[model samples]
Target: KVIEVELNDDYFNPNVITIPINESTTLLLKNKGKSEHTFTIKKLGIDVVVESGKEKNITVKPKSAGTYELICRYHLLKGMEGKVIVK
Candidate 1:
């Protein structure tokens, strides 16, 4: 399925998401604020950077069940984060 997420005010809405194992999930990231943002999946060691007024589409194929942390590189210290829970 497709998951829609937004980055604004230096934070990510819907900080957590759960998906079935081995599922292919599409993450649609939109930047709604006035700055750049980076969606980094720390455990996966992957990152997607988007500028203001732009958007990005990412496909995540979860092979195992675990909790992964996602954060923005530019505003991580300000609490711009999220979690991906694969079940």
Candidate 2:
């Protein structure tokens, strides 16, 4: 599978993504924010850090098939609107 998530200043793109089940998978997480952030998904055991003005990739190997949530634990304002609705 292929995916590109663009991180921005206080926001991120690709609010959601899809993946084939019962197989190995990976995604491209590109960061271009003005601050550091972590692509954290607690339940899935995921946490990738992307420093400011740079790129830090993230990942996920779905042990199963279902939806998941993603967030920048140390970025964004009021968590206004940033998430990944994995489909």
Runs of candidate 2 with Cα error greater than 4 angstroms are 75-77, 80-87
lDDT of 2 by residue, 1-87 (tens): 667777776666766666665544566767676677667777678777787666654445566656777777864557713444444
Q: In order, how many clashes per candidate?
A: 0, 0
Top lDDT model:
1
Residue 80, model 1: Cα distance from true site in angstroms: 1.3
Model 2: lowest-lDDT 10 consecutive positions: 78-87
| Model 2 lDDT, full chain set | 0.65
Residue-level lDDT tens digits of model 1 in 1-87: 998888876888778877677878898999988988888888876699988989999888888789999888885346788898889
Instruction: List all candidate RMSDs to the true structure.
Output: 1.3, 2.6
Q: What does the lDDT read for residue 76 in candidate 2? A: 50
List per-prediction Cα lDDT, in the order shown: 0.84, 0.65
Kindly provide the TM-score of model 2 when superposed on the true structure, using C-alpha atoms. Answer: 0.74
